[PDB]
Ligand binder design. Structure first.
Ligand SMILES: COc1cc(OC)c(Cl)c(N2Cc3cnc(Nc4ccccc4)nc3N([C@H]3CCN(C(=O)/C=C/CN(C)C)C3)C2=O)c1Cl
Length: 265
């Protein structure tokens, strides 16, 4: 494995901690060459014990793609790597509050989220995707499980450099993935937000779903969701991919809704 000094961190600067789920929590000493006695909590990905050449080359590809995508506050960013003195470690931002799906579920009547919190969560995820889309990145598996939440409740898209129930019909039938299918997935994600982590299409057997969808079946409005946000979901689920809003447009619409949503409802 060849070295890349723009990202290399010496292996002894990383104190490995607990498993996160392979991914471990760790402390990086002097990650910022400016502030060299500072420790920063980071997440580190490395290979499993019985892991194949394929697994290795995918880890590297994911890393290489992360290098190219550049930084955004609403995605999980690359921070460094140890590639030399032993096993490959890929170092990324740590999100202390875990994934959004579990974050939401734990806050069903851990503390209540306001309506404004919920819309602002959607906004942030949309911003992340707007960025990824602007860099011509197609996610393919956008879902609340693939958003992570920081200590400061910043939402960050996960696993963007690499379930049927989040796939646009044209992804579902023809394996055609586009920015537009990701928008479909975002509509499902919106629905997850406003059900506080609900299971999509409850009781619908997977094998029935594409038929149901081609037929025009769509999820009902969550019990506590405005008509406005439900129409956004529905728009994301336009049968015709061209007719769905862009992430650009969703960001603008959500920004306006956030601003009109009080901290008190
Ligand atoms: C190349 O490495 C990457 C690339 C990534 O996206 C391009 C991502 Cl998202 C990761 N992350 C980064 C990451 C950051 N922060 C956490 N925090 C955390 C996880 C679980 C519990 C508490 C905090 N995790 C990250 N992980 C995974 C590690 C397991 N994750 C889960 O969402 C696990 C859910 C199961 N649940 C019961 C804990 C996210 C990752 O896989 C890593 Cl390590």
């Amino acid at each position: 494995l060849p070295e890349d000094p723009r990202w290399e961190l010496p292996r002894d600067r990383l104190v490995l901690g607990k498993p996160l789920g392979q991914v471990v929590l760790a402390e990086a000493i002097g990650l910022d060459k400016d502030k060299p006695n500072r420790v920063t909590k980071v997440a580190v990905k490395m290979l499993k014990s019985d892991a194949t050449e394929k697994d290795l080359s995918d880890l590297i590809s994911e890393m290489e793609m992360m290098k190219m995508i550049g930084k955004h506050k609403n995605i999980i960013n690359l921070l460094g790597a140890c590639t030399q003195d032993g096993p490959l470690y890929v170092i990324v931002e740590y999100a202390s509050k875990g994934n959004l799906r579990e974050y939401l579920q734990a806050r069903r009547p851990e503390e209540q989220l306001s309506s404004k919190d919920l819309v602002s969560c959607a906004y942030q995820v949309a911003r992340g995707m707007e960025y990824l889309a602007s860099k011509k990145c197609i996610h393919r598996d956008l879902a609340a499980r693939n958003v992570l939440v920081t200590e400061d409740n910043v939402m960050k898209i996960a696993d963007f450099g690499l379930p049927v129930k989040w796939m646009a019909p044209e992804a579902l039938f023809d394996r055609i993935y586009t920015h537009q299918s990701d928008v479909w997935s975002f509509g499902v994600l919106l629905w997850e937000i406003f059900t506080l982590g609900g299971s999509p299409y409850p009781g619908v057997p997977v094998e029935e779903l594409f038929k149901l969808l081609k037929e025009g079946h769509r999820m009902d409005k969550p019990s506590n969701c405005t008509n406005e946000l439900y129409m956004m979901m529905r728009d994301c689920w336009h049968a015709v991919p061209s007719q769905r809003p862009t992430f650009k447009q969703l960001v603008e619409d959500l920004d306006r809704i956030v601003a009109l949503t009080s901290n008190q409802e």
